[PDB]
Design a protein around this ligand. Structure first.
Ligand SMILES: COc1ccc2sc(N)nc2c1
Length: 171
């Protein structure tokens, strides 16, 4: 059975209990913490690509009012985010299972851009999600996994200084 787990869930949970924030910039900003995933139960000889996308967790714009994040009253449909391909892709099951799969090079932007960078909606809340795609084989297969512990609001600057302090303490 294919098992997907979050590495350093302890740390992620401390961010989550404060309401996590990730910076987005025109050129794109790397994530901290980095999403790192433990995977077991792949066919070590089979070929797979690791994909990352961001689900809009709700349909609302958020705003930091009197030191607390509060959702707007005017929800709108959220266009799904683009997919980031893990740069080790495609790769053997053995490669993916030998160490945590680390998305250290994904960049989050607020502007439609050349390539690599993933555009997100400013002040919307996101739940990171991966897709494990079996490739090259005759029978294509996809397993998806969400990481609620890794939820965050996309911001152009940090609102809650508790988040800023944790980002610095652990980086
Ligand atoms: C996934 O990134 C985006 C960026 C801007 C907008 S406005 C809208 N309706 N949804 C989105 C999603």
């Amino acid at each position: 059975e294919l098992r997907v787990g979050l590495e350093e869930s302890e740390l992620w949970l401390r961010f989550k209990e404060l309401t996590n924030e990730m910076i987005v910039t025109k050129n794109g900003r790397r994530m901290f913490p980095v999403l790192k995933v433990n995977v077991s139960g792949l066919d070590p000889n089979a070929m797979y690509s690791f994909l990352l996308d961001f689900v809009a967790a709700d349909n609302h714009r958020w705003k930091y009012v009197n030191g607390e994040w509060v959702p707007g009253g005017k929800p709108e449909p959220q266009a799904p985010s683009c997919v980031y391909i893990h740069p080790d892709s495609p790769n053997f099951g053995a490669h993916w299972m030998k160490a945590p799969v680390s998305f250290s090079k994904v960049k989050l932007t607020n502007k439609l851009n050349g390539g690599g960078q993933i555009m997100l909606n400013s002040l919307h809340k996101y739940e990171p999600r991966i897709h494990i795609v079996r490739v090259g084989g005759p029978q294509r297969m996809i397993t998806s996994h969400c990481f609620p512990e890794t939820q965050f609001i996309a911001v152009t600057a940090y609102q809650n200084e508790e988040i800023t302090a944790l980002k610095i303490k652990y980086n």
